[PDB]
Design a binder for this molecule. Sequence first.
Ligand SMILES: [Mg+2]
Lengths: 297, 302
Amino acid sequence: SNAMKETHNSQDRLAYLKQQLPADITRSVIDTLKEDLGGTLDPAADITASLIPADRISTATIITREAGVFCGQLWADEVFKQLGGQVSIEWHVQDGDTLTPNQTLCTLTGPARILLTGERNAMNFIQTLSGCATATARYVQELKGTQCRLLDTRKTIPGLRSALKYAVACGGGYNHRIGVFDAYLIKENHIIACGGIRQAISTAKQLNPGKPVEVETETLAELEEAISAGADIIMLDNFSLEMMREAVKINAGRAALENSGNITLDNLKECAETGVDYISVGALTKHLKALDLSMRF
Amino acid sequence: YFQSNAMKETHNSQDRLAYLKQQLPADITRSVIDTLKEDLGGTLDPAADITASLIPADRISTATIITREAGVFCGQLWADEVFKQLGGQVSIEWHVQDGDTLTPNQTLCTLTGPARILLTGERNAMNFIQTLSGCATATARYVQELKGTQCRLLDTRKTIPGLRSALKYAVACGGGYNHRIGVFDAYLIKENHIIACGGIRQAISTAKQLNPGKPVEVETETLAELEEAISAGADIIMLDNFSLEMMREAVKINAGRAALENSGNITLDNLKECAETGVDYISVGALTKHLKALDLSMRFKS
Ligand SMILES: [Mg+2]
């Protein structure tokens, strides 16, 4: 079925993402350390840490004061590798694990100056990615009892697209297109330009074979036309609950239906209960509620 | 020569405002390039946008970016850079300037150029404006709570990765003040450094020796530690989780000798009350660690 086919598209995207992550992790980490150190990757630039003896070895633990879902160990590991690799980390949690208040995330051991310099940077990644995974899981809870799945969007904090799409995955959400290069999102503008939905879809399939094709519809008539034109996925743009139920009944399980627009944590369940297959939520990646962490020596 | 705490703080702001201005153009370009490459799949070539390829190449369109809620605007330079990086064919007429107060449904800018380029750049430009404006907007909200007081709002090092300079700038646009940019421009002496040096005056004199002009801040958890820190020559004292009465006692003990900065579980609910104790500054991690993006919308006229 088309709904199950989208689950396959989501896994293909997560695969592309995992393949690109090492490079993206290195890039964000370097830029973050550079900003903190003042344009250099030399940890000796941390003036306060220099008040500690050069030879001191210390052990610290990072703890979450809040419940949620963990994400970010790969980024925290890279922070310490970029600082020289002298600090070793024992992780007590894995990406995607549920966290309870005051749970220990990891234990770090190495030169005290390095731990001091890397601590905030490592925590800034963890709190951000964990924050996104945590928000995602809260949204996913609203779908209980339905077969509906949550999708992310292109409304992401700049520089962290791949990290946030990964955190969404860690929180139980699914990935929609990574960018404008991996899937088509056909809208009214494109439909008019090509002279009809079937023509737009055909052009899309001829220009980039294999790329998923999604069509945005604003009315039931458009939906019906997109379904008739064989569309893979149909995005329902600002549909009322009534229109959603009607769309689901009209569709009869043919295409994958995805609702988009003005979705809040407070009305997500009601949207899912109409029978739509997916709900896209820009709030998962456009907003951020960082997980509160503490580092103790 | 004489240098008041007011003068020391102004000097500190001048230095980091100077640092931010010199480094900002490079950070804007760096962040914009990384953001476009993520969206286009490894390249800055707009031809990588497959759905935009369904629009005739020679169409020239006009669109506008609208805010759907009130707040403070920020990010003009980043949105400009998105279009410069995509080829510079898009012309942007701004109807607002960084720092401006916004009302719901207000038009931010009107863009004109090749349709395919507008389609590729729109989300990217919007992602920057919603982020920076969101930060500026939240900051302004905290600043509004400080009105009747002489208290100032400070940022921290708890910032979203890769956006430290952009967010320090957004906090400034929202009316907040910038604390140290990183670990290189000022000291933040804590208990472990004190124990390592054998006391507070020891830590402070060792700091001034190694990096003479760098401002020295000391974090304290008690009134006793506060008094040692001030009498030992700290420029700024960070009060860690002080109660309201401890803050009042702190202000009394200080007698204007050092600048006092509150760092605690301070939110919109208790910001005013904490400010009313007489502390000079309140540092708020929430301004840059969290984000409530400003809700934007792009409307194509043609
Ligand atoms: Mg409910």
